[PDB]
Design a protein. Structure first.
Lengths: 529, 88, 88
């Protein structure tokens, strides 16, 4: 298709217009007291929000060249949020500040290549100072504070998240799930869950709650089919003459097996249920031991899969609490053999963690965290489905932000961390005048988010910034400005803290996208229509 | 009434902002005034005595129709204080 | 300084008038305040003692130029109190 190319200063002017239009709408929502942004909904009432992430998601411009700058900053700002939770609005604010100041320096005749070198050097100094300012998380007190700040300053969400981390542990998984309840609740279950549920709905004990939990279950996992009448009747009759509650796990589902169990359930002879075949491939071996963690019996595998039945003293399979859903099942309790196969827990902690470098940790954690003590589910409740949507997304980000805080530490919030880090740029010196300009660009940018927060709350930004700078020497580095109430206090003591990962990623990502746009020389886009 | 009040507050609020007032401080004053007004409204209110006030409220709630007010007042009397009245 | 003061008075006066204040009474209040301010200024005044204050005043008025201040201080000393200084 025919394309139009824009060169040089004209190309950067288009990017500046797009970045400014995106940043101006987003930056007004920064802080705990951001201004409202109204978004049109087709054939419905308008949506009023202060999220910033919601505003950025709806931003798109007709001009392809202005859209280039908006989408480039949006993609980088989203990457900051994905890695460490919060930081979408802060990265956008920082990116605009660096880009606008960089263009002004270039317009005065400075070398763009030397400016980028000064920008890179300043960012490295700022990042190092951020690490020095950070402190490790102590316990539940800081975890609760981080979760509260990560959300819309909601204490109820922060308390729920902090409790979820306490119950789950330091290496589990916290899941945020759907609900229709009028209030948000925390659901914690011991053991591990399975990605699949009912094989047949006839097993349901009570249709109103649709639950068919089995007491003292004797589960039968099979690495072979073992689902015909010949394959099951000696297993069934041995179970029948033993009375053990029956759970059948096989390679696949059989119509013959379910038909006789539904008849048996109607007759009530045997406590039969099935969870088809969760997992794939070598994941079975982990699943084989997962039940062996709790029932204390050896895995059937294919050894007992052959001979049509487990003949030797194998697979006791004696649990005491198993849950079932439509596409979910949880094995909760049993006689227990956790310590014996804790060597495999040690093994995966020793082996699979060693091979994490291929970025397969998502598969390992999806196995290790389930194989851990237990998991917790966050239950979300709101007024409308639309109100339910952004609250669920906000809770997930708060959980991710809390995890990042534990990984790297916390820093004082409200933009104080960047202000303290920017103070070390005063002593940083270079032999090139243009590189010095890039250093001053970052110093000005680092002090921008604190002014924006003060401006949004209704205070003069430069007055607040001057007071915060003075309080760094008079009181301490952790002293800053609170935006919920217009007074200065110790942010760390007050609980207004941010993960140090969020601050570190936001400044690095913003400087990265701004640097590329500063040296951009051509924009290629198709001619519309 | 809500639409009339909303326009009055919005129009006067914009005039104050146009003169240089802080919008955040304007909202704080608006919130404080509303709390005082609501408290005074509760003080001014009186409990409903019986059928006389119920009939009057129903008449005013409709287009000042006495027939509708009488019918509604009778419906509350016959049904009771905790039932349901259906319009068909 | 006079222009800066004039803008400040007008801007603040507009805010007061926008709140419903009487413009005539605001002007009367402004006149009373200025009389107090002028009287306080006269009390704070200090008479000129000699060449030191003359040179300091000339230097400040010349945008911190010591060369101009020295020349003007010499000019006043030569012509005395009744002299006239011309700039060409
Ligand atoms: N009470 C407070 N006083 C001062 N600063 C605060 C306060 N609460 C939060 N902050 C700061 O405000 C910023 C968070 O505001 P927010 O608008 O969520 O920014 P973001 O996290 O970059 N955007 P999003 O990704 O949409 O959450 C952080 O820098 C917090 O430290
Ligand atoms: K906000
Ligand atoms: Mg946030
Ligand atoms: Mg009416």
């Amino acid at each position: 298709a025919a394309k139009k190319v824009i060169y040089g200063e004209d190309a950067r002017a288009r990017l500046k217009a797009g970045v400014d239009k995106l940043a101006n709408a987003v930056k007004v929502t920064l802080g705990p007291r951001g201004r409202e942004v109204i978004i049109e909904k087709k054939w419905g009432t308008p949506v009023v929000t202060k999220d910033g992430v919601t505003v950025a998601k709806e931003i798109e411009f007709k001009d392809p060249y202005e859209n280039m700058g908006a989408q480039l900053v949006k993609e980088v700002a989203s990457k900051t949020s994905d890695v460490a939770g919060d930081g979408t609005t802060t990265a956008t604010v920082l990116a605009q500040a660096i880009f606008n100041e960089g263009l002004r320096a270039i317009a005065s005749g400075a070398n763009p290549m030397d400016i980028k070198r000064g920008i890179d050097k300043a960012v490295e100094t700022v990042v190092n100072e951020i690490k020095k300012l950070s402190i490790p998380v102590s316990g539940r007190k800081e975890i609760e504070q981080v979760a509260t700040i990560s959300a819309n300053n909601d204490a109820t969400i922060g308390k729920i998240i902090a409790d979820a981390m306490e119950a789950v542990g330091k290496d589990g998984v916290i899941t945020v799930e759907e609900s229709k309840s009028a209030e948000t609740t925390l659901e914690t279950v011991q053991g591990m869950q399975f990605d699949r549920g009912y094989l047949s709905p006839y097993f349901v004990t009570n249709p109103d709650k649709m639950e068919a939990v089995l007491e003292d279950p004797f589960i039968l996992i099979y690495e072979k089919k073992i689902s015909n009448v010949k394959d099951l009747l000696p297993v069934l009759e041995n179970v029948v003459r033993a009375g053990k509650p029956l759970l059948i796990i096989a390679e696949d589902v059989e119509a013959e097996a379910l038909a006789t169990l539904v008849v048996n359930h109607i007759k009530g002879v045997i406590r039969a249920c099935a969870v088809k075949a969760p997992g794939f491939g070598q994941r079975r071996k982990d699943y084989l031991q997962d039940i062996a963690i709790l029932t204390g019996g050896t895995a059937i595998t294919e050894e007992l899969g052959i001979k049509l039945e487990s003949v030797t003293l194998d697979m006791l399979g004696r649990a005491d609490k198993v849950i079932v859903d439509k596409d979910n099942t949880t094995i909760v309790g049993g006689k227990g053999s956790k310590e014996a196969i804790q060597a495999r827990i040690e093994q995966i902690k020793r082996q699979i963690l060693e091979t994490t470098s291929d970025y397969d940790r998502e598969k390992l954690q999806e196995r290790l965290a389930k194989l851990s003590g237990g998991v917790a589910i966050i239950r979300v409740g709101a007024a409308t489905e639309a109100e339910l949507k952004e609250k669920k997304a906000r809770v997930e980000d708060a959980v991710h932000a809390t995890k990042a805080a534990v990984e790297e530490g916390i820093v004082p919030g409200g933009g104080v961390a960047l202000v303290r880090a920017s103070e070390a740029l005063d002593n940083l010196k270079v032999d090139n005048a243009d590189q010095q300009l890039g250093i001053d660009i970052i110093k000005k940018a680092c002090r921008t988010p604190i002014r924006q927060i003060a401006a949004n709350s209704g205070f003069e930004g430069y007055v607040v910034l001057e007071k915060v700078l003075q309080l760094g020497k008079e009181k301490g580095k952790n002293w800053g400005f609170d935006a919920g109430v217009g007074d200065y206090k110790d942010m760390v003591e007050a609980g207004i803290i941010d993960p140090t990962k969020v601050v570190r990623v936001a400044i690095q990502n913003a400087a990265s996208v701004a640097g590329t746009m500063l040296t951009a020389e051509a924009l290629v886009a198709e001619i519309p229509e």
